[PDB]
Symmetry: D2
Subunit: 347 residues, 4 copies
């Protein structure tokens, strides 16, 4: 069969529950608990779906991460005892990329920009990125294919200028506040563009480029690779620009392991089946399948989505769900009515 049309809706509840869980730890100074409860909620809700999924991006390798590890099977239809209950569409093998708590320290500190997020494609349709750093360029649909990761920041800004029909001074670039980004940040400033420095969470940033209204027009710089794939899934559905390139030279940025060399990482990467380490991937290559689904729900408030709010009588969440199948981008504002609220606010 083919990826069940219905899955594109069902993931709403996946990211919603994971975000609600993690959001209870907002500002409580426990990034690992914030992460853990989101992992658990996401895993529980996924296992209630009639699907046949494999984690290809997640919390770690099988023996580092107990839940949502790479290779893990999730979905009612992965159980031999239950397979008989699944229809042919539900039995289609799909690959899943999860990030139950994007911005664990954002949550721990109660700062903006965190979310519970996942992407899905049929088997093989999502790049199973290693836990390496990744050089990224995200930009809006109007700049897609025009800007390019190999060009300088200065040139890309000029191109964005022409594509978005506005001055460089009327552009905003998001860059992670990291020592690895000093020269880059300086270059963008000298070119005339405004900047947002973020402490964490460059999935939100990348995707914010797609929507006129966010006052964010590009993401430049190095973040984490698994995150990049998840971002690219959103951007491929939205027609947004997203390119990535693995960084493995510890001179540029370091993972922190006591290794710790370009040769060593090159060795690990080769043995992971990555033939060209310096390869540039466009958005269609990082998320390559025939069907791509993406779901995010805000934990703390952010550019695309409101944060989780707890009030007398319930919870309110905001999610963004994108499906290449229905070709839709849905914002879902959910009032979770917990104990018969006497007042229900419109917004």
């Amino acid at each position: 069969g083919s990826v069940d049309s219905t899955l594109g809706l069902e993931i709403i509840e996946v990211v919603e529950q994971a975000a609600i869980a993690s959001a209870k730890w907002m500002g409580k100074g426990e990034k690992n608990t914030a992460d853990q409860v989101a992992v658990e909620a996401m895993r529980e809700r996924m296992n209630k779906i009639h699907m046949r999924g494999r984690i290809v991006i997640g919390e770690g390798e099988r023996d580092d991460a107990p839940m949502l590890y790479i290779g893990e099977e999730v979905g009612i239809c992965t159980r031999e005892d239950a397979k008989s209950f699944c229809n042919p569409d539900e039995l289609v093998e799909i690959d899943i990329a999860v990030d139950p708590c994007e911005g664990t320290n954002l949550v721990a500190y109660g700062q903006n920009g965190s979310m519970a997020v996942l992407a899905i494609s049929e088997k093989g349709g999502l790049f199973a990125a290693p836990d390496f750093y990744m050089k990224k360029l995200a930009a809006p649909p109007a700049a897609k294919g025009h800007v390019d990761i190999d060009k300088s920041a200065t040139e890309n800004l000029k191109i964005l200028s022409d594509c978005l029909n506005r001055s460089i001074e009327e552009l905003v670039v998001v860059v992670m506040d990291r020592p690895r980004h000093k020269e880059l940040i300086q270059e963008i400033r000298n070119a005339g563009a405004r900047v947002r420095l973020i402490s964490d969470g460059d999935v939100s940033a990348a995707i914010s480029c797609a929507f006129s209204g966010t006052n964010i027009h590009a993401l430049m710089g190095i973040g984490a690779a698994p995150e990049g794939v998840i971002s690219a899934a959103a951007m491929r559905c939205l027609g947004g620009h997203f390119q990535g390139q693995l960084i493995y030279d510890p001179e540029v940025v370091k993972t922190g392991l006591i290794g710790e060399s370009r040769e060593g990482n090159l060795e690990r990467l080769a043995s992971m089946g990555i033939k060209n380490p310096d390869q540039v991937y466009n958005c269609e290559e990082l998320a390559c399948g025939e069907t791509v689904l993406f779901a995010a729900c805000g934990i703390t408030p952010g550019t695309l989505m409101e944060g989780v709010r707890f009030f007398h009588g319930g919870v309110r969440t905001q999610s963004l769900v994108i499906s290449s199948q229905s070709s839709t981008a849905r914002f879902v504002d959910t009032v979770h009515m917990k104990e018969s609220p006497k007042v229900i606010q419109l917004h």
Copy 2:
């Protein structure tokens, strides 16, 4: 042992109301209220027939052999096939009753006017009052007022009660009433009592449900509208904890159905025949939508209080829907950008 209504149905109905709304919206302002109606009907039906469910229409366009589509009794959904046990699971095979109003405010759509929507409600078999095509006196009010106002009380007394419940003056209340001659005295009374009023030319489903949300600046619906619209309204209010009561009105002196030589005595016979023992009965919304599970879904056609209208732009379409489920206990606003042809610009809002 039974299946339970599939949790996934509460999300799939999003696409049902969206596709219906979109179709109808193409006819906004074209002065064809039947066309605007028919395309909505067809699109809602098609989208339902792709769902793994076993539905029976109990509120719809008319009787079989009269209405061609979504007639009373019509079977909808894939699990309605004879082969179904082979292709559907126990949750999906649960018999469900469905109330539809694919185009509520058909004339609003024809004139390009506010307040029309594609709407539907669901429950287990027998879980929705299969209302006849008669008029219904209604009282809708917000959750804070539930059980405190009452449909048999005068408008004057309900307003005082609302005033206490919503902690504001009668001058700070807004009541919706259909602009109809049958409401001359009622409107006069609301005016005398000091409340402000919104008169509507059509579409009292939106009016009733607007009462449930703070921010609509609508606090009650009073008066008489169509009965089936009342049930669909009640389904939503039951899930939200809102107040909704209804009472069949079958008296031509009060309101006429357009029947020839229509009479109260005539109307009762027709009502008796349908197994309606007490024509003067007052139902609250738990009785109008009494099933174990209740789902409600709406999508704006033209703009209104709760939902933006359908918008067509270069590269796609944008819809807003309200979907409510007693099962997940949720109220969902769904803002969907339908990307039809690779839009170079996508607006956040």
Copy 3:
């Protein structure tokens, strides 16, 4: 001595108080009462401003309309000893077009699209429209000068399609629901556009054209002339397209005059010194002053502005105020705190 910059701000309170007054009559079935209280409030509030105004568009002639009649002086600096208490900027002579309750029957019925509105310019800067009908064409800035009131609805729709970069099916035209538009409406329908038929209030209709987000892209057809001028004032500041042409032929439309004749109407027109009755005006002609101010506040809810809301402890209004002097379009969301409210809503 030039129009006081500050007047651009003060007119916020003018429309606010007028709209609040009228709003108390929402749904009350009295369209003259709703009108009269807006008139009085707008006048009272104008008479507290240090300005020197003359009404050129208003409620009627002296010895007929009691308030805001043609020629009425309004403002503190119209007084005999004004040079004593008013500065030179405040003593500049300004002409003022008022429509204190635009959509009197909308208010009476509690229906959408009514507002309190006024426009201001130096003396001579606003066309003193007679009380005749006016054929109008409004469209967005990107269409300015490309569409034309003398072209057919069909031709204009084509031009709009090109200017707004969308199909005719993706266009929405507002036309007043009137027998006189039977044919115009049929043509728009045949051309493939969607339509909003309004029962009253073509001021809101015209200006909605100027703002992306309203899903309204043109106003076509005949309305009242003074309303047109006030519309043009706003459109000239926004760079929107607005043309108008007086209509005085009874076969086309009737002002309800007894034994009304076209030729009889021409006499009245000539009498006011209108040389060419068939003249087409663009908005720069209808609002030709060096300085143009416009202010509007929603009475009932509408496309551009939320209506007046009364709640426990206050009132909430939304206004739109535009100035060619400061070159600004301001949306003003005001919470009027009446009773030390215990709860203040963000929105």
Copy 4:
């Protein structure tokens, strides 16, 4: 009496300051972001027919060139004022300014920064010294019921009852500072959620006043002048706001080389502050008969969206509050600079 018109004119003051400062969003120059805002605000203020004295601002005349303590601002401070200013324009007023609140938020392009000011008749605003101030901000529903002298734990219980929601349904803003370690731990232990901010507690304080911000209290120590400016908004809104000067280096340090508790007290006495430990009421920090408050977002925040630059213009969002007209005004302004062919409704 204070001119009714001033309550509107201050819209342009904060808008212009904000716009100038926003040009430096993320450029890494907190002092530039600061300077340009200071200049635009001063320049705009000097076009107003008012008789203003700065009681809170950039520093002493010797230290700070613009908007220094004591500076006269406004057309009606001119020697010829009687001849071209009416009596209301000639009323002496005091002014607290903070042209760029969150200089570093701007430099990093981070949320929470604003151009802000408050105004009262002469004597109407506490001319705070540049010392620290313990603060408690809360919504109108809690005004008088919470108290700054109670523990965070007590206040949270009181908040819960006043706001009719559980402590877990509360969110408390606290500045991310070593001085707040215990404070934060206590709030966490009581079960409330927390938003930690790197800077910008003016926004934090005032967000408690509006339902919909999902912020319910500010607790902790920030800068005192910012506190007065906050009090002015809260006094007009019916919000709870208390402050108390903190002047012991043991608690928090100002960086004075010979900074000592006794050192700071002598400084306080000199300024005419009789009781350094006095707990100030909202009505006492902004005690004038008439209070005005104006703010405009620089970067985005809880109450006000940031300055946006686009093709053909600029968009700002301001909050302007007046005890005189008893209004809270959100002002969303499209600044049309180059005849924009496209104008967004929002």
